Amino acid sequence: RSCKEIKLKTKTKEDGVYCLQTKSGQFYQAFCDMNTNGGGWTLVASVHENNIAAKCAIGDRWSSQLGSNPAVGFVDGDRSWANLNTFGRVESATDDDYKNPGYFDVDAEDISVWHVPNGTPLAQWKISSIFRYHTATEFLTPLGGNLYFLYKIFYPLVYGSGTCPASNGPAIPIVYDFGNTISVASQVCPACLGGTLQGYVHLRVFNNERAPFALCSGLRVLDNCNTEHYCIGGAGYVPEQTPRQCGDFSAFDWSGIGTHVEWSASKSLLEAAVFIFYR
Amino acid sequence: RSCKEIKLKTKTKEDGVYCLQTKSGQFYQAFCDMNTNGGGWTLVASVHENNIAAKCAIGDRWSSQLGSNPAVGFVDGDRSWANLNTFGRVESATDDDYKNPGYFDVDAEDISVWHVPNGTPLAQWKISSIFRYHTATEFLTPLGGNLYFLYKIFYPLVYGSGTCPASNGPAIPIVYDFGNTISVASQVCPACLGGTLQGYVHLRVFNNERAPFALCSGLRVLDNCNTEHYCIGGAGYVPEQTPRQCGDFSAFDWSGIGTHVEWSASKSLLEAAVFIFYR
Amino acid sequence: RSCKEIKLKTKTKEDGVYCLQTKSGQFYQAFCDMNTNGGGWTLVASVHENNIAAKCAIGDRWSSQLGSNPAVGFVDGDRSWANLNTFGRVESATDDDYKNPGYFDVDAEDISVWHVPNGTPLAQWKISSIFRYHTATEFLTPLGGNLYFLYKIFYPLVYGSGTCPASNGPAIPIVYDFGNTISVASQVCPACLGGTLQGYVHLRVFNNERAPFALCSGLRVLDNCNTEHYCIGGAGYVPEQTPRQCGDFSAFDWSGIGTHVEWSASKSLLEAAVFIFYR
Numbered sequence: 001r002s003c004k005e006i007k008l009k010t011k012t013k014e015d016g017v018y019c020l021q022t023k024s025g026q027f028y029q030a031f032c033d034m035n036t037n038g039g040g041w042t043l044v045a046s047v048h049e050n051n052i053a054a055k056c057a058i059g060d061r062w063s064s065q066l067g068s069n070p071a072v073g074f075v076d077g078d079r080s081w082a083n084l085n086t087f088g089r090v091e092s093a094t095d096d097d098y099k100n101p102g103y104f105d106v107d108a109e110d111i112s113v114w115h116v117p118n119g120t121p122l123a124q125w126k127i128s129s130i131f132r133y134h135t136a137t138e139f140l141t142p143l144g145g146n147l148y149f150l151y152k153i154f155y156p157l158v159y160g161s162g163t164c165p166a167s168n169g170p171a172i173p174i175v176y177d178f179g180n181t182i183s184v185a186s187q188v189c190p191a192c193l194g195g196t197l198q199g200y201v202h203l204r205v206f207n208n209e210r211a212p213f214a215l216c217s218g219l220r221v222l223d224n225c226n227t228e229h230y231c232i233g234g235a236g237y238v239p240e241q242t243p244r245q246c247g248d249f250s251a252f253d254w255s256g257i258g259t260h261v262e263w264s265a266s267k268s269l270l271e272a273a274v275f276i277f278y279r
Numbered sequence: 280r281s282c283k284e285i286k287l288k289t290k291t292k293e294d295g296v297y298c299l300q301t302k303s304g305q306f307y308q309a310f311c312d313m314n315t316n317g318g319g320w321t322l323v324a325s326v327h328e329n330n331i332a333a334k335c336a337i338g339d340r341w342s343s344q345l346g347s348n349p350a351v352g353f354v355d356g357d358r359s360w361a362n363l364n365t366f367g368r369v370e371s372a373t374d375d376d377y378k379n380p381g382y383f384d385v386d387a388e389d390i391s392v393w394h395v396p397n398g399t400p401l402a403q404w405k406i407s408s409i410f411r412y413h414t415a416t417e418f419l420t421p422l423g424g425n426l427y428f429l430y431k432i433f434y435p436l437v438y439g440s441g442t443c444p445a446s447n448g449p450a451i452p453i454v455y456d457f458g459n460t461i462s463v464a465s466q467v468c469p470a471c472l473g474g475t476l477q478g479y480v481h482l483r484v485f486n487n488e489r490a491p492f493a494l495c496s497g498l499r500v501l502d503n504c505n506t507e508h509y510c511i512g513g514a515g516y517v518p519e520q521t522p523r524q525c526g527d528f529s530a531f532d533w534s535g536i537g538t539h540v541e542w543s544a545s546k547s548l549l550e551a552a553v554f555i556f557y558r
Numbered sequence: 559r560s561c562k563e564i565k566l567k568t569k570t571k572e573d574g575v576y577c578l579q580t581k582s583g584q585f586y587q588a589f590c591d592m593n594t595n596g597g598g599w600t601l602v603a604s605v606h607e608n609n610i611a612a613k614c615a616i617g618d619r620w621s622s623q624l625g626s627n628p629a630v631g632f633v634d635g636d637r638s639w640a641n642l643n644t645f646g647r648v649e650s651a652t653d654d655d656y657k658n659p660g661y662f663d664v665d666a667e668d669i670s671v672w673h674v675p676n677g678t679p680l681a682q683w684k685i686s687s688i689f690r691y692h693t694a695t696e697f698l699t700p701l702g703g704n705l706y707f708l709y710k711i712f713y714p715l716v717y718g719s720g721t722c723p724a725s726n727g728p729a730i731p732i733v734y735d736f737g738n739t740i741s742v743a744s745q746v747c748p749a750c751l752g753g754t755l756q757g758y759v760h761l762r763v764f765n766n767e768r769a770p771f772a773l774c775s776g777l778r779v780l781d782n783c784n785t786e787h788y789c790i791g792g793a794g795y796v797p798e799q800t801p802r803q804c805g806d807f808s809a810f811d812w813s814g815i816g817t818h819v820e821w822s823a824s825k826s827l828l829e830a831a832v833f834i835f836y837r
């Protein structure tokens with residue numbers, strides 16, 4: 001049902017694709033990592049950005065595909081963070097979004113996160129990745145066991161029904177597998193660090209506009225509610241300069257693509273699919 | 280090749296996913312139901328509505344995805360009712376449209392229909408469903424054996440090439456597996472019942488505008504040609520108040536979503552994926 | 559890993575679907591042809607056109623899905639010719655685009671091309687096809703072994719970075735498996751032949767506007783740079799009468815659909831999915 005038990009019964013197993021099945025019984029294939037900290041991490045999702053200029057258009061499966069509309073039928077986006085919809089396949093996880101049943105079925109304790117440059121074939125994924133970390137606090141069990149139930153518990157990613165830090169989500173300390181806080185500070189915007197703290201993963205942050213964002217990889221949000229620039233995923237509506245802040249990678253191009261200025265992420269991060277692993 | 284033979288050779292089998300193959304030989308997995316009336320029903324399709332406000336937009340795979348355009352290249356929609364295109368996977372059949380090869384390959388005698396609330400995991404599908412029925416007239420054999428050939432025989436779902444009841448499709452009497460005619464009358468619009476009769480499934484009805492609709496689940500159409508409000512699927516063009524009548528669930532929101540008024544379906548039906556089974 | 563070795567170890571095998579795996583190990587199914595010139599051709603792609611009137615819209619996975627935009631994030635299209643993204647399934651390869659891992663993994667010497675009318679079930683593919691040819695020059699080995707590496711070598715299909723014939727791609731002589739140069743001259747536009755020569759396949763031609771097109775099936779381009787009318791695929795931007803020249807089948811409808819006049823392809827070719835095989 002996961003790569004963890006595969007590592008458990010069968011010790012010497014290594015990285016690669018394995019056959020798994022949901023407990024309801026449908027088969028699928030998942031990329032098991034078996035070397036990271038005892039191994040056993042199952043790849044369950046990937047947040048790829050095909051076009052930073054396309055503001056909630058085709059391919060922004062994680063935020064919205066029909067635009068940024070505040071209508072009652074639009075503010076919930078695609079719910080791809082909190083629904084059973086699955087898409088993409090394994091070896092294309094670095095060229096377009098990917099999500100397999102293991103996202104919601106497999107129960108887990110910790111999540112691991114990789115940043116892999118787009119276009120990277122499978123055999124390079126671990127060595128070509130620029131950032132790799134994972135949590136070690138077993139925080140998923142009180143939250144339902146996976147991110148699906150984590151977004152049934154606080155939060156349903158709904159626009160407007162919260163506020164910045166007063167209503168933010170959890171902030172989990174991470175351990176670095178590849179990369180370091182200096183590199184973290186080198187990949188995010190310059191004005192990023194003025195309101196964050198490296199070394200944590202943050203789930204369901206609220207921006208200044210009450211719009212919720214799923215994930216902030218690498219840093220915990222401080223009292224700075226300009227979170228559209230360093231957190232990915234989201235709902236289907238953001239009102240500040242709409243729709244310049246829509247997409248899988250919400251506003252990483254505020255001041256120009258990859259130019260790495262006050263509000264612009266480094267180019268190395270604009271081309272980085274964010275792999276999510278369960279254990 | 281189907282779940283019927285699986286039930287035949289191997290008796291005691293129950294609900295769940297099984298491995299099947301088309302006669303051309305490609306493998307797939309299908310959810311076999313084995314308790315309904317001797318069992319043996321294969322799940323072959325699912326008409327999910329992700330956004331009732333999106334009029335022939337992304338996700339309306341059963342009616343049209345490019346809008347309601349009367350141009351010569353547009354009036355045929357996506358033909359997903361009468362083509363070999365397949366999409367989605369099994370356990371996501373309750374969060375987005377689903378269709379597997381068994382739709383056109385497997386020959387069958389009867390169809391079964393379920394209404395399952397969106398977001399329902401597989402293990403709940405039968406018990407959480409609100410409506411379940413099936414035909415018992417073996418009407419698919421004269422029509423080619425499945426719905427694909429049923430839409431090669433009358434009708435190619437083409438706009439304009441017919442009229443209401445004078446050119447309507449078949450009306451098959453159904454037996455109720457869960458639900459009853461009172462509940463049926465409770466789920467459809469109020470002004471619905473003024474022109475229909477419970478207890479039948481109707482295929483290829485024509486609306487007042489000559490636009491054809493694939494399926495009317497639960498009721499047979501009378502001389503009332505306002506069929507956009509209780510029949511799903513369709514072609515790529517409907518001219519009355521275009522495009523307020525486009526989508527997988529064509530006009531179930533004419534007078535407000537789920538408000539259950541003169542032309543509005545009950546909320547319980549707006550969130551209901553329509554599962555189709557073959558036998 | 560391909561159908562070639564399946565033909566090699568196991569002689570008498572015939573046309574049909576077989577199980578293959580990438581060298582990284584993920585399984586898939588591919589349609590192996592085993593009769594063409596010793597057989598062993600693996601079906602790896604299919605360029606289907608669902609709507610000639612939709613100019614770079616949903617379903618034009620090979621050229622662009624977000625329109626014809628000259629913005630820096632748009633001129634590269636979807637890169638589906640040169641990325642690991644895969645989509646569609648086998649038996650639907652004649653109703654919508656299709657591409658499997660064998661596109662980029664399998665190394666090959668020659669390519670075969672079929673034109674199959676849309677809606678054709680699998681069992682008819684070979685006999686219902688109108689054109690079938692294949693190269694016999696083993697030209698893929700110097701280019702990386704497949705079309706993916708062929709579009710890492712010249713050319714990255716990028717708009718503007720070339721010109722017509724001075725910077726065109728390779729022109730490979732083909733042998734005819736079904737069809738002949740008279741039929742070829744009968745399927746393309748009338749004003750087509752005034753600037754081409756039958757009997758070659760041409761990869762990465764540049765149109766008069768420096769926009770690059772992936773493939774010209776059946777003919778080699780002469781000094782005529784009006785290539786938008788007989789070459790398929792492309793990038794995400796064409797500037798002449800934008801966007802009347804966008805789509806999988808770029809401009810085969812310049813003077814009316816299927817009307818077979820000066821700039822219009824024959825109707826038999828407008829409904830023809832282009833199957834690509836490796837060996």
Ligand SMILES: [Ca+2]
Pocket residue numbers: 047048049050059060061062096097248
């Ligand atoms: Ca994306």
Ligand SMILES: [Ca+2]
Pocket residue numbers: 207208209225226227228240
């Ligand atoms: Ca802000």
Ligand SMILES: [Ca+2]
Pocket residue numbers: 326327328329338339340341375376527
């Ligand atoms: Ca739908």
Ligand SMILES: [Ca+2]
Pocket residue numbers: 487504505506507519
């Ligand atoms: Ca009406």
Ligand SMILES: [Ca+2]
Pocket residue numbers: 605606607608617618619620654655806
């Ligand atoms: Ca296409």
Ligand SMILES: [Ca+2]
Pocket residue numbers: 765766767783784785786798
């Ligand atoms: Ca031209």
